Design a protein around this nucleic acid. Structure first.
Length: 178
RNA sequence: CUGCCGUAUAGGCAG
């Protein structure tokens, strides 16, 4: 169904490195996805460097002709349209391998894990008891900067039924990797 | 980072 996509490139900037730009971008897309609603908008990073742990300088936006045509018709790129080079929406080539672009979270800050352990079992007691490409974001509710880690899954011959979160990440859905 | 789910020092989530 999601046979349409659109690449967005981060135009080189003297003061802001690419990594910083992709952050802004991803945040922009997010705010617009919670506006669009639905779970049919995918996302991939074609320039993904699985070694250097860098997302790259390109954000591929997956969607159907209608869903995709509805997204970019919003003013979610006002702030950085001058920071972004992007063509028209085209149709994905085939045959194309499929993979998952999903968030990943590890367990750490035991001060945190233990605090929860205490809540669920009623500091001295508790105290006793990941290398991936990341985008850094800022929450709307509490003004905290958190690192959203992203991982591209092993290549598959097909795509299983699945949707996507308001960040365009895999909720179980697959995206064409090319 | 903060929190949620889960007996979990399993495995998962939310922003």
């Amino acid at each position: 169904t999601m046979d349409h996509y659109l690449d967005i490139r981060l135009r080189p900037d003297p003061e802001f490195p690419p990594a910083q730009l992709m952050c802004v971008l991803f945040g922009k897309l997010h705010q617009a996805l919670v506006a669009q609603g639905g779970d049919r908008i995918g996302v991939s990073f074609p320039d993904l460097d699985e070694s250097r742990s860098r997302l790259g300088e390109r954000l591929r936006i997956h969607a159907s002709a209608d869903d995709l045509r509805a997204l970019l018709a919003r003013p979610w790129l006002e702030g950085l349209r001058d920071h972004l080079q992007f063509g028209e929406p085209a149709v994905v080539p085939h045959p194309t391998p499929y993979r998952q672009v999903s968030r990943v979270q590890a367990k750490s800050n035991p001060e945190r894990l233990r605090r929860r352990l205490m809540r669920r079992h009623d500091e001295e007691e508790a105290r006793k008891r990941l290398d991936l490409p990341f985008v850094t974001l800022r929450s709307q509710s509490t003004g905290q900067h958190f690192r959203l880690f992203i991982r591209h899954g092993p290549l598959q011959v097909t795509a299983e039924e699945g949707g996507f979160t308001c960040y365009g990440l895999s909720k179980g859905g697959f995206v064409p990797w090319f």
